[PDB]
Amino acid sequence: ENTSENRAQVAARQHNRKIVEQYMHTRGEARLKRHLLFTEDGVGGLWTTDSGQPIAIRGREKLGEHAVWSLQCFPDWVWTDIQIFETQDPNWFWVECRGEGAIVFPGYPRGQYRNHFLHSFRFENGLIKEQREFMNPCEQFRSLGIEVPEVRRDGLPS
Amino acid sequence: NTSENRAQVAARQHNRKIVEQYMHTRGEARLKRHLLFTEDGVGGLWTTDSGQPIAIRGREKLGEHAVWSLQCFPDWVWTDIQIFETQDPNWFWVECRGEGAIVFPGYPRGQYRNHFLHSFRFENGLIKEQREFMNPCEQFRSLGIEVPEVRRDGLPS
Ligand SMILES: O=C(O)c1ccccc1NC1CCCCC1
Ligand SMILES: O=C(O)c1ccccc1NC1CCCCC1
Incomplete structure (x- = not known):
């Protein structure tokens, strides 16, 4: 039905979608400002790790510091x-994608990493409150030798 | 409030009930879950150590895989x-946990638990493609x- 409540929802979803698109298209030096898409207490990171615990980076400033490591x-x-x-949920999106690029981890040889990814994006007031990356860590092992x-x-x- | 839309609401409502069913199937009822797929439907595990999915194709093969799965x-x-x-009314994601005994030939019996994402794509009210994504490392652990x-x-x- 056409109600202002349903309209609000549509507008929220629409604005959130554009932020997901922006996140996923951010490359190179722009990655250093991608933390600005997060709430001040926003969380990001990798949920599928060999250890079984996530690597969860908490807070918009810690996310910016993390972008420096990620870019290298x-x-x-x-x-x-x-x-x-x-x-x-107009505040909850999923993304299915691939990704590829060099992987340069100290203490391993330079590699080429490719994987299949699922990302979760939860929003609050039009900013990202929680981003989670899911992948198959075995493909990352291969890339590392x-x-x-x-x-x-x-x-x-x- | 078009029929165009009503059609999809119906599909999505119907398909959601089949996702609920699938996710709530336990015990012996697992041996008939293959019946929730299309005749040519595919299910299986998309996050493997080998890097290739274990894709089970067709209702028949899915019914056979259930016997394995239950053992x-x-x-x-x-x-x-x-x-x-x-x-998409014919596309759902599910986030869930799961656990239970793991009893594979040649490994010690273990307790396996993991976090899971499932993708369900429908055709004509049946599951045309189900895909499980998890962290294979937790399954390694479960097997020693x-x-x-x-x-x-x-x-x-
Ligand atoms: O893959 C990683 O080691 C990782 C660690 C913490 C946070 C995110 C991580 N995954 C991203 C790093 C940048 C895009 C490719 C994969
Ligand atoms: O986990 C597996 O080894 C597996 C292999 C093929 C298809 C599905 C698989 N995962 C399901 C098997 C049944 C119990 C929950 C996880």
């Missing part, structure tokens, strides 16, 4: 094949 | 289920398999 370790990164998923364990699934059909 | 994960349950509707530790050396605190 992933200097030429690009997200590709971006699919943005609005949800029934780290041997990947193999699970044998005997009986799996076929 | 290897005899008491599996999904919890903390959050279902996300999308702008060593997980390497990635060092991120100048990562700020």
